[PDB]
């Protein structure tokens, strides 16, 4: 394709795929996908951007702590519970109460699931007044001591006992690959949860603080003839909503074990599908419409779900939050385990490789990171490890101690012995200054490594040296 400039960038992201090869090939389509430049993103937002001025294709894969990413969810919005000592005689819908020292707070709260002789099974407290009242007097989501739960004065019957704990902040799931997929959707410690909380397993594609913004609406074919009159509740939160779905959908659910999903973000009905909990049921296309496979294949952009202790005839307002991407702290092998997507011919046609893109990271990490990638168009040989120095070096000072700094370097000598770049490959093309762009963004000029810029001006001129496109200043000039 002028022989295919195929780039290839890994870096930290504002929202995933986490740990994919996803392909990009606009700008207005890599916002749509990981896209707003954070002040912990940028230099990658920009490594991409002001690429596909010259780019055609561009394979990138988002690097996330794996320890402490999350994708928003259901569960990151309930109180921890404990039903300590399950009564007798109790009913479904008694009412429970949490206060604050002798005082109310919740009412709303009430018993969920009985057994045959009403043992306290299962409860449903909403938070929403709690966790303002919480925030309100510094116990967030710390609470406990002064938080105290009691049961309708009264209930048909007696003798139970629940504890109430912290406000959970673990949405409890994050989404990488696919291999992965549902199998973290399937985990004993998350489906757990959405037993006692009794919710869907419904959660944010992306990991990220972007994924609280979403809101689910779900509805089944027995609330959906009352569309319109059945009000919906709202979890975790709490209240009511009057439902929507006969007044968005003309194709109803049909089956009993088919719902209507309605997914929102900023009041913007994203998208609006029927699905089903029942394996091999399909629509009036016989497009297998089982939750679990149809997001099991770029059913959605937005969500995942899984049939898996959905709740029967359930139908309410889901309300994801805990979402949390953390760039905040993705260790440099963080990144070094994204890169290496591309380690292998067999499986990736990538010819450029935009490295520089960790010019602004922590000194070390801005040195062993590229010095892996080179690594990696080293063993490999199908490709182009091109890499630009550090901000550190090269943009604060002037030339005089400039040139020194990069030539240490570039060998170890003085001050970078230990954070050398001292290697060198055919393949390793490094990248000599640090340009200064403008932001369309976060409206603000800023640096960002260069090399990112000079790879799409390779995937032009020839096959994969003629001014550069956005620049407005250069670290040094020139001359």
């Known amino acids: 394709n002028n022989s295919t400039g195929t780039a290839a960038l890994a870096g930290k992201f504002?929202?995933?795929?986490?740990?994919q090869i996803k392909q990009v090939t606009n700008e207005v389509d890599l916002v749509n996908t990981f896209g707003q430049p954070t002040a912990e993103t940028a230099d990658y937002f920009m490594s991409a951007m002001n690429f596909l001025q010259y780019g055609n294709d561009l394979r990138v894969v988002r690097a996330v702590d794996r320890d402490t990413a999350k994708n928003s969810s259901p569960i990151a919005g309930n109180i921890e519970y404990t039903i300590s000592t399950p009564g007798s005689n109790y009913a479904v819908g008694d009412k429970i109460t949490v206060k604050y020292v002798s005082d109310d707070i919740e009412t709303e709260g009430k018993i969920t699931e009985v057994d045959a002789d009403g043992k306290i099974k299962k409860i449903n407290i909403p938070t929403a007044k709690i966790i303002a009242k919480a925030k309100e007097v510094g116990e967030y989501p710390t609470?406990?001591?002064n938080w105290t739960a009691e049961i309708s004065s009264s209930s048909s019957g007696l003798a139970a006992v629940i504890t109430l704990g912290k406000i959970i902040t673990d949405s409890g799931i994050l989404l990488a690959e696919i291999?992965?997929?549902?199998?973290?959707?399937?985990?004993?410690?998350?489906?757990?949860?959405?037993?006692?909380?009794?919710?869907?397993?419904?959660?944010?594609l992306y990991p990220g603080e972007l994924g609280d913004k979403i809101e689910i609406e779900i509805v089944s074919k027995a609330d959906y003839a009352k569309g319109a009159s059945a009000l919906l509740p709202i979890y975790p939160g709490g209240g009511t909503r009057a439902s929507t779905a006969k007044a968005v959908f003309g194709y109803g659910p049909q089956t009993d074990s088919q719902y209507a999903i309605i997914v929102r973000r900023n009041d913007a009905i994203v998208q609006s599908?029927?699905?089903?909990?029942?394996?091999?049921?399909?629509d009036i296309y016989d497009s297998n419409i089982y939750i679990d496979d149809f997001f099991a294949k770029g059913g959605s952009e937005y969500?995942?779900?899984?049939?898996?202790?959905?709740?029967?005839?359930?139908?309410?307002?889901?309300?994801?939050?805990?979402?949390?991407?953390?760039?905040?702290?993705v260790t440099a092998g963080d990144l070094m385990e994204a890169w290496d997507f591309f380690a292998d011919r067999e499986s990736v046609d990538v010819q450029l490789f935009i490295a520089g893109s960790c010019a602004g990271e922590s000194l070390e990490t801005a040195s062993t990171?590229?010095?892996h990638v080179v690594s990696i168009g080293d063993v490999r040989q199908d490709c182009l490890v091109l890499c630009s120095p550090p901000r550190e070096t090269v943009v604060g000072i002037p030339v005089t101690r400039a040139v020194d700094n990069l030539v240490n370097w570039r060998t170890a000598a003085g001050s970078y012995t230990d954070n050398n770049f001292n290697i060198s490959s055919t393949y390793a093309a490094i990248?000599?200054?640090?340009?200064?762009?403008?932001?369309?963004?976060n409206d603000v000029n800023r640096w960002v490594p260069l090399a990112a810029d000079i790879a799409g001006l390779c995937a032009r001129t020839d096959n994969v040296r003629g001014q550069i496109l956005n620049v407005i200043k250069l670290a040094i000039e020139t001359p």
């Not at 504002?14 to 740990?19: I, R, S």
């Not at 969500?303 to 905040?328: D, K, V």
């Not at 990248?431 to 963004?441: A, E, H, T, W």
């Open 431 to 441: 990248d000599g200054n640090y340009k200064y762009q403008y932001d369309k963004y």
């Open 369 to 371: 990171v590229q010095k």
């Open 273 to 282: 599908v029927v699905l089903s909990t029942k394996r091999g049921g399909k």
């Open 14 to 19: 504002q929202w995933g795929p986490a740990f």
């Open 179 to 204: 291999e992965n997929a549902e199998a973290a959707m399937t985990a004993v410690d998350f489906q757990a949860n959405l037993k006692k909380y009794g919710i869907p397993g419904v959660v944010a």
């Open 143 to 145: 609470l406990g001591s």
């Open 303 to 329: 969500i995942f779900a899984t049939a898996q202790n959905w709740p029967e005839g359930f139908s309410g307002i889901l309300t994801l939050s805990g979402g949390l991407s953390s760039n905040a702290e």
